[PDB]
Symmetry: C2
């Protein structure tokens, strides 16, 4: 009866990840079609992407029962949502992207290493800006 | 070279995380919207545009090794439609039906019906992309 700990919980998280990536992929594909002059194709990728947004947000709604897939924290309210966003961003900029940059440099992918470092700096900016917003929140 | 490297796996993982971050932030924006937290909502939306740029940059690197969802070549509209159809096909023949069955076996009847609704949607998407590919003049 409890979603927490079930296979269904893991399935919702996986499906949420897949839906999220589908929207991003289809918008990338729309941009390619845009440049090529395939305007009907581009419009279809965009329309389909809107479906994937609906699917992802439906998955997230069920996952309110168990926590944010990125952090395990409760979500729903702006206060909660900001806290979760800050935790997630903090992980990305302190641990994830610097680690990925190091691995890339070690493997000989200097440009991709620099890309990962650019992104570490960007997530730090996002984390700081969300923390400012959380301090300014009136609820 | 990127294929088989740790860096390939990291780009895939980071692409998945950026994708989710955008979806989560827009979900959070809609919550803020209803609460009247309009400045908050705007910030979630602006941040979400950042995460689009991040994800799309990851994908550009992955053009060298294949679509993270399917393993297939992507780039041209023809390739992109082919990869989309393959992914959608996986979703409606395997992924969502399998998830529905598990949900039903665990007693989550509403979540099972949600997964079935989605299987049906992804089948519709597949069929519509196939129709577009049949019409593609390139
Ligand atoms: Mn979908
Ligand atoms: Mn960010
Ligand atoms: Mn990002
Ligand atoms: Mn679909």
């Amino acid at each position: 009866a409890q979603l927490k700990g079930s296979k269904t919980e893991e399935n919702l998280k996986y499906a949420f990840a897949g839906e999220s990536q589908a929207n991003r992929r289809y918008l990338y594909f729309a941009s390619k079609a845009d440049v090529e002059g395939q305007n009907d194709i581009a419009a279809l990728f965009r329309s389909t992407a809107e479906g994937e947004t609906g699917h992802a947000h439906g998955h997230l709604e069920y996952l309110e029962a168990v926590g944010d897939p990125a952090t395990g924290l409760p979500f729903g309210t702006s206060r909660q949502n900001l806290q979760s966003a800050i935790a997630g961003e903090t992980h990305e900029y302190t641990d994830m992207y610097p680690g990925m940059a190091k691995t890339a440099r070690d493997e000989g992918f200097e440009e991709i290493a620099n890309w990962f470092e650019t992104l570490a700096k960007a997530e730090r900016s996002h984390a700081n800006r969300y923390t400012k917003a959380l301090d300014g929140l009136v609820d």
